[PDB]
Amino acid sequence: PSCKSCGAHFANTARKQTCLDCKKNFCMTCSSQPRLCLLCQRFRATAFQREELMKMKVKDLRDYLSLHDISTEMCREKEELVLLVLGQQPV
Ligand SMILES: [Zn+2]
Ligand SMILES: [Zn+2]
């Protein structure tokens, strides 16, 4: 077991933080506040508004989708990444 973000291990595996959104494990320093990792927290803040998502860095959109186990290998334009983020939004 290691942190999905920084790759580090835990001094006590029982203290690893599981993100409620992507469900991966993270450091306390790699998560915040509904315990969420920093990226999932950042995306929730956008309220999943297309315009706000479009302003996000390509790497963040790609990484966020990867954390949610969604492939972006067939995407050629940034808008496709945004559409995938919108598609997996919880309702
Ligand atoms: Zn997460
Ligand atoms: Zn970490």
UniProtKB/Swiss-Prot annotation:
Induction: Down-regulated upon DNA damage. It is found in: Cytoplasm, Cytosol; Cell membrane; Recycling endosome membrane. Ubiquitous. Detected in spleen, thymus, prostate, testis, ovary, small intestine, colon and peripheral blood leukocytes. It comes from the Eukaryota. Autoubiquitinated. Palmitoylated. A zinc finger (FYVE-type) spans 1-48. Residues 53-72 form the SAP domain. E3 ubiquitin-protein ligase that regulates several biological processes through the ubiquitin-mediated proteasomal degradation of various target proteins. Mediates 'Lys-48'-linked polyubiquitination of PRR5L and its subsequent proteasomal degradation thereby indirectly regulating cell migration through the mTORC2 complex. Ubiquitinates the caspases CASP8 and CASP10, promoting their proteasomal degradation, to negatively regulate cell death downstream of death domain receptors in the extrinsic pathway of apoptosis. Interacts with CASP8 and CASP10. Interacts with RIPK1 (via protein kinase domain); involved in RIPK1 ubiquitination. Interacts with PRR5L. Interacts (via RING-type zinc finger) with p53/TP53; involved in p53/TP53 ubiquitination. Interacts (via RING-type zinc finger) with MDM2; the interaction stabilizes MDM2. The RING-type zinc finger is required for the ubiquitination of target proteins. This is E3 ubiquitin-protein ligase rififylin. The lineage of its organism: Eukaryota, Metazoa, Chordata, Craniata, Vertebrata. The chain holds residues 45 to 139 of 363 of the full protein.
